[PDB]
Amino acid sequence: GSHMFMPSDRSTERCETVLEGETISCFVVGGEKRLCLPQILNSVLRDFSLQQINAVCDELHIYCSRCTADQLEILKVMGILPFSAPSCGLITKTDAERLCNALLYG
């Protein structure tokens, strides 16, 4: 058992937010919505190269976190990711908005 060692709460539900016209699934962590990165890359930023996206993320000091086992499962149950997805990155709402703004406009 891990509970006796005082583990932190895990994600138990998902939510969503609208990013540049697309509804993206998220998990609230630390008071901020964390957006499913693959979903963004496959929709709002579908026509941008991963090289450019990555380059701009670095310039904006955007850190992409990794889905916990619980978050990965929830996204799969929601049909957002295939059941065979090995992992999934997350990006904060603020970071995602700035990234899309930098790429889509100006």
8 A C-beta contact, residue 24 and residue 35: yes
Domains and CATH numbers, the chain: 1-106 (3.10.260.20)
Q: How wide is the angle at C-alpha 76 spanned by C-alphas 38 and 4, nearest 5°?
A: 110
Of 18, 7, 19, 23, give the one whose Cα is nearest residue 68. 7
Query: CA 103 to CA 95: how far, in whole Å?
Result: 12
Of 96, 82, 75, give the one whose Cα is nearest residue 13. 75
Alpha helices (H) in the chain, listed in sequence order:
37-41, 50-59, 69-77, 93-104
DSSP, res 20: T
The residue type found at 105 is Y
Q: How wide is the angle at C-alpha 14 spanned by C-alphas 12 and 16, nearest 5°?
A: 165
How many Å separate Cα 37 from the centre of its chain?
4
